[PDB]
């Protein structure tokens, strides 16, 4: 008979995939029953059938986890690379901690800035910066936030900077919050699934099962719009091509089509958006430029981008929508230039295909039909990234799809925990809970609070950010405890104050000028992931010291080592001291991570880490306690802010995940009473809602949107009830979502002004005569139907913005601008303004930009389903599935260059080159754009110089060092290259 079942007596542990943001459940199997004498070893991993999103399924990345956990390239011991050396030397943990602390202290004491030139206390340290791990837990993230900020760091970013920064920059201004609005299983309710700006069948495969459920079992139409015919196109009902960098034209064309045919949800638009508000008379737009442009600073004065004010100080309105200055009529005028011929001329999308998409989208303007948009980097990674997103969001507000089951904006996050690190604020000027560090002009608490607490711009609105001071003071009580009191303004002056944002491109520009001494890379591989790799390696080489913390060997850790054409450097010329510290991976600790749907999910430890690897919090605590002890005995600069940060863990060298998770939830520091004199919480108890946070020092929380995650009822992130009573796929008992377990944001819009569902088969919330109740937790207060209170409760006007007032850097309405490296060399809509007029482009990077005479083809970079960044090439299973680097090109271009399928080619740009196998296919086809034939060369990003797959070249050797005008997110998706036979 068959071999026996190999897991019958193994230890079974629950955990969550460590790669993308779907958050699939895992069941991991270890050799050993947990007895103290058996050292557990994970030997198989499969899916958890009870998880509501994955239901047992795992894509090739999650299914291959065993080979990542047990990779031959797992890091085992602390290693050190001496200046000008060509080899690693093994050191002890205590030597690593003491050498790093000494280097840090010397640099901090030399360059710490206590006061700025205007006399304000700013306590900031700029010569050492940090990259944080979006693949590590939320408890690691909060420890990293405390470590960084208590030292005064401002150059602190996580992957959000090169990823979904633009989403937050456009979705927050439009709807009030920057996160994905619905959740994976909810996509099954859609009537139309649009995959544009994303490739969900390859980038989020197990979450995409729900789009296949809507197509196959809800009769939905799946549409893919992309320069390439991808694996998501394989299963699509409609495929339409589009030139990289032209989404705003296509989407603005869709707005013009909807308005012109009156394919809108008119009552939704009239009440839930700002359509009826009146805009200042001085607002204008002409020939590519909005009013207020200052051509020398390349920035706009946004004074005119605002509403007209009434007598009470509120925005003026015209409910009939006939006034020439209402948002609705200015929107109509703005998009009138984007006709179907203009879309075809700029995007290259055939009019017949563009028409099919417009007609299907238009069918969801009915109240009981919805479109859901699934997108990610195809829209964010541009110099107009944020504006791409604004256009789509506007479409969803015209169709009335926000707040509906099967509707919304599913901005699919990337890393497993990029949503938690964004929530915890590991971004230059951020604090946890979407709070902001003080700017250096805000000289006291009162100024700071006033700048961050918005006044309502229409009467009768929830305007929930009016509670900013309760969140802020609670954060300060979490950080400083008894040291933060009313008398010292809750420790206000201990936080670093910023003079500007220290985004990654800027900070590498400072590193190139010799202003950066040290850098930490915690679970981030910038040699692979940052634009213009040859410049990145040059900038890192000027560092005096680098600390890498990771479970695997990365290209970044070996940037000083010669790897031939892949990394042609001279070790003897690089003086950086490099510390490589071996950390745990997802399977070797307990903790939480937040998926794309905002679900905070707990996971448990299945084995110890290999060798002398330690957990991320233990590595930060080693360095931190050595450093703070040096300050205790030698003194130095910025002593107080550093020494006042709390580190209240039972074992200070080993902070536990539950202690940190509980601090994020928050506690009552005194007994708390409601207005009726009823006890709401006792001193010492975990809080059950952010509604109980106060601004008087009686409450603490290091992450206000996380209040409710771990209460007196227990760890809600460990809840495993997959019940779905409505049949809509909403499982309120599985894990815990922020905010307050609301799974579908903006769900008051799922009903009309009288409280009646737009679609009676999809009721989310309903009015019972005194409260809202239903199949989801209401994202709303208790305003009764018929009152003026808008459903977007974080917006000061309570509405979805069609016109984004003064929030966007380049305009309150989106406008087409070409990529910095464009194949046309001009912009057919307005040749006087080719590219975004507010883009920041450093002079050194401007010299490294190419033109179409030398680099005639559009270059774009993207992912393949089988690999995750340059991480899974260290896993044998994934290396077998896609072993060797390739690039994709059309049959037409291959014939022109005499390239046969499978031949080697050389792909180059103004910054460098890569060599690879050529995949020649009809899936890529030239498009007719502005009288030219434009070809695209496709460059997957998974290969490099470390790993078990065949050695290749970093794709970022080709990409430009320029980014979105709002978040500085690099333009990785549209640039210019040349190709030659090799």
């Amino acid at each position: 008979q068959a071999r026996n079942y190999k897991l019958l007596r193994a230890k079974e542990i629950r955990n969550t995939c460590t790669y993308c943001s779907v958050g699939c459940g895992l069941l991991m199997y270890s050799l050993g029953d947990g007895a103290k004498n058996a050292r557990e070893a994970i030997y198989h991993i499969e899916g958890d059938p009870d998880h509501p999103v994955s239901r047992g399924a795992l894509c090739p990345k999650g299914a291959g986890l065993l080979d990542y956990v047990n990779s031959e390239n797992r890091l085992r011991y602390p290693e050190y690379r001496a200046p000008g050396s060509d080899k690693w030397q093994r050191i002890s943990w205590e030597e690593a901690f003491s050498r790093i602390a000494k280097l840090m202290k010397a640099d901090r004491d030399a360059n710490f800035i206590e006061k700025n030139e205007q006399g304000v206390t700013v306590n900031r340290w700029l010569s050492t910066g940090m990259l944080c791990a979006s693949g590590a837990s939320n408890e690691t993230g909060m420890l990293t936030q405390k470590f960084a900020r208590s030292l005064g760091m401002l150059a602190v970013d996580n992957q959000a900077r090169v990823x979904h920064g633009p989403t937050v920059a456009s979705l927050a201004p439009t709807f009030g919050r920057g996160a994905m609005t619905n959740h994976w299983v909810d996509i099954k309710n859609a009537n139309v699934v649009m995959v544009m700006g994303g490739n969900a069948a390859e980038a989020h495969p197990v979450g995409f099962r729900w789009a296949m459920e809507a197509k196959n079992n809800n009769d939905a139409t799946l549409i893919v719009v992309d320069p390439r015919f991808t694996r998501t196109a394989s299963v699509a009902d409609i495929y339409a091509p589009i030139r990289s960098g032209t989404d705003i034209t296509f989407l603005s064309g869709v707005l013009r089509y909807l308005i012109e045919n009156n394919k809108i949800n008119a009552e939704y638009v009239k009440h839930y958006t700002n359509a009826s508000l009146l805009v200042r008379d001085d607002f204008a737009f002409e020939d590519g430029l909005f009013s207020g442009y200052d051509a020398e600073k390349r920035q706009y004065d946004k004074s005119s981008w605002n509403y007209q004010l009434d007598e009470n100080g509120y925005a003026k309105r015209d409910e009939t929508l006939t006034h020439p200055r209402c948002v609705w009529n200015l929107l109509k005028e703005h998009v009138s230039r984007y006709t179907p011929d203009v879309v075809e001329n700029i995007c290259g999308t055939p009019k017949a295909d563009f028409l099919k998409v417009c007609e299907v989208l238009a069918s969801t303007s009915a109240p009981d039909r919805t479109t859901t948009f699934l997108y990610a980097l195809g829209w964010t990674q541009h110099t107009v990234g944020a504006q791409n997103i604004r256009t789509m969001a506007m479409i969803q507000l015209l169709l009335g799809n926000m707040g509906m089951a099967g509707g919304g904006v599913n901005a699919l996050r990337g890393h497993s925990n990029i949503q938690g690190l964004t929530d915890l604020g590991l971004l230059s000027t951020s604090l946890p809970g979407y709070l902001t560090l003080p700017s250096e002009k805000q000289v006291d608490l009162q100024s700071y609070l006033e700048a961050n607490t918005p006044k309502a711009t229409l009467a009768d609105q929830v305007n929930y950010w009016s509670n900013y001071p309760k969140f802020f003071v609670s954060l300060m009580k979490s950080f400083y405890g008894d040291a933060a009191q009313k008398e010292n303004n809750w420790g206000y002056d201990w936080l670093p104050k910023w003079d500007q944002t220290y985004d990654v491109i800027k900070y590498f520009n400072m590193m190139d000028e010799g202003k950066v001494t040290g850098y930490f890379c915690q679970g981030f591989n910038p040699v692979a992931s940052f634009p213009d790799k040859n410049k990145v390696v040059s900038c890192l080489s000027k560092l005096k010291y680098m600390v890498v913390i990771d479970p695997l060997v990365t290209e970044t850790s070996t940037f000083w080592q010669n790897h031939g054409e892949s990394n042609d450097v001279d070790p003897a010329s690089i003086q950086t001291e490099v510390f490589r510290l071996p950390s745990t991976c997802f399977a070797e600790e307990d903790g939480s991570i937040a998926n794309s749907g905002r679900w905070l999910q707990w996971h448990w430890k299945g084995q110890d880490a290999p060798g002398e690897a330690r957990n991320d919090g233990e590595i930060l605590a080693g360095i931190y306690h050595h450093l703070r002890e040096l300050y205790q005995s030698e003194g130095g600069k910025g002593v107080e802010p550093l020494m006042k940060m709390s580190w209240n863990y039972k074992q200070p060298h080993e902070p536990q995940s539950d202690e940190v998770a509980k601090e994020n939830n928050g506690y009552a520091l005194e007994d708390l009473y409601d207005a009726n004199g009823v006890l709401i919480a006792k001193k010492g108890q975990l809080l059950s809602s952010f509604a109980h946070l106060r601004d008087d020092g009686t409450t603490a929380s290091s992450c206000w949107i996380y209040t409710g995650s771990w209460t007196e009822q227990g760890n809600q992130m460990a809840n495993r009830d997959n019940s779905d009573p409505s049949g809509l796929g909403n499982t309120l008992g599985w894990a815990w979502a922020w905010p307050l377990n609301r799974r579908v944001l903006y769900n008051r819009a799922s009903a009309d002004i009288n409280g009646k569902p737009w679609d009676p088969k999809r009721m989310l919330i309903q009015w019972n005569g005194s409260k809202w109740t239903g199949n989801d937790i209401p994202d709303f207060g208790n305003a009764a139907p018929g009152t003026p209170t808008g459903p977007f409760i974080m917006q000061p006007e309570g509405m979805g913005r069609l016109f984004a007032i003064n929030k966007m850097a380049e305009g309150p309405f989106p406008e087409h601008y070409e990529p910095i490296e464009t194949p046309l060399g001009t912009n057919p809509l307005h040749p006087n303004v080719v590219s975004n007029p507010v883009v920041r482009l450093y002079e050194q990077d401007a010299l490294r930009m190419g033109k179409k005479e030398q680099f005639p083809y559009v270059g774009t970079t993207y992912r393949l389903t089988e690999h995750f960044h340059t991480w899974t090439k260290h896993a044998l299973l994934n290396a077998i599935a896609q072993p060797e680097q390739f690039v994709e090109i059309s049959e037409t271009l291959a014939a022109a260059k005499g390239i046969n399928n499978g031949d080697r080619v050389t792909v180059s740009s103004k910054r460098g080159f890569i060599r690879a196998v050529a995949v020649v296919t009809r899936r890529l086809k030239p498009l007719n754009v502005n009288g030219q034939q434009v070809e695209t060369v496709g460059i997957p990003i998974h290969w490099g110089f470390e790993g078990v797959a065949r050695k290749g070249y970093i794709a970022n050797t080709l990409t430009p060092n320029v980014g979105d005008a709002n978040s500085q997110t690099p333009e990785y998706k549209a640039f210019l290259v040349n190709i030659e036979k090799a």
């Binding site: 068959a2 198989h44 399924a57 394989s234 299973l877 077998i880 020649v920 009809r922």
Partner: protein
């Protein structure tokens, strides 16, 4: 061998001495691969190798997504990709390939080693490696070109239908892992029902020739497909139209044997009765009288 006492067919075993099969009252199981829901993610390749404790070599890219390029002793299932404009627009047809667990397996019929290949009552066809002699006859007997020899041990291997999971009540590894639910598993009777429902929805979307691939030539298969173009299976990277056991193999393994047997028996009789009847042919039979 035969511990499960449900062995309905056994290679190289005379038809009058059948294998132990008293416990044969069990439902037939089946995998259903609906290629219209497949996203070509290769999860099934990864889950299969992880579960089965096998790893192929790190190969090369030669111009296509397909990889490994073929089934092997270390790769029991592989995704096969096809780009075509034969139906009027560009289509990317992706199909999971691997053993079909035929009702009337040609591998089993061609195998000359007793017990090397067996068929369980639930439909699983599996290799019993202790008996394999490495001849490769099963590679030619299979209508689907499935069996693969392992150079390190001279034995053939292929998809076992996760017999080690199914035998104790769990579905196969690739079935559970499939991201989009393109792969389904259950009893054959309920997979044929799911297949017919899916065909009906594909026809409703415009695929007038959608159909179930469960070839009657091999007696039906326990690994079945739902195909958008069932009239043109060769579009799916060469899936055979109307597969059957080759005529030459049928005759070689069939009638040739008894015929040869009769010749041999008859010949031996003839020669023996001939020697006895006529007697030796010596130099002189004549001066014997």
């Amino acid at each position: 061998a035969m511990e499960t006492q449900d062995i309905i067919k056994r290679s190289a075993t005379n038809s009058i001495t059948p294998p132990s099969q008293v416990r044969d009252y069990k439902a037939e199981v089946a995998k259903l691969i609906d290629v219209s829901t497949c996203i070509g993610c290769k999860a099934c390749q990864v889950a299969c190798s992880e579960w089965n404790d096998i790893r192929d070599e790190v190969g090369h890219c030669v111009g296509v997504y397909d990889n490994p390029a073929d089934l092997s002793a270390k790769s029991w299932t592989v995704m096969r990709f096809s780009e075509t404009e034969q139906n009027g627009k560009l289509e990317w047809l992706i199909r999971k390939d691997g053993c079909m667990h035929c009702e009337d397996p040609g591998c089993l019929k061609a195998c000359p080693s007793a017990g090397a290949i067996i068929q369980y009552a639930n439909g699983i066809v599996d290799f019993q490696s202790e008996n394999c002699i490495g001849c490769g006859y099963c590679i030619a007997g299979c209508p689907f070109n499935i069996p693969r020899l392992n150079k390190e041990d001279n034995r053939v291997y292929k998809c076992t239908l996760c017999v080690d999971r199914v035998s104790v009540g769990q579905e196969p590894a690739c079935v559970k892992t499939c991201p989009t639910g393109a792969i389904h598993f259950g009893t054959k009777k309920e997979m044929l029902e799911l297949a017919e429902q899916r065909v009906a929805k594909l026809k409703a979307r415009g695929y007038e020739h959608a159909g179930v691939y469960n070839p009657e030539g091999v007696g039906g298969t326990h690994v079945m497909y739902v195909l958008h173009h069932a009239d043109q299976p060769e579009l799916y990277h060469g899936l055979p139209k109307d597969p059957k056991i080759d005529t030459s193999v049928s005759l070689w393994k069939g009638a040739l044997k008894p015929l040869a047997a009769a010749g041999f028996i008859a010949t031996f009789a003839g020669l023996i009765f001939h020697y006895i009847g006529i007697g030796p042919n010596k130099e002189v039979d004549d001066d014997e009288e």
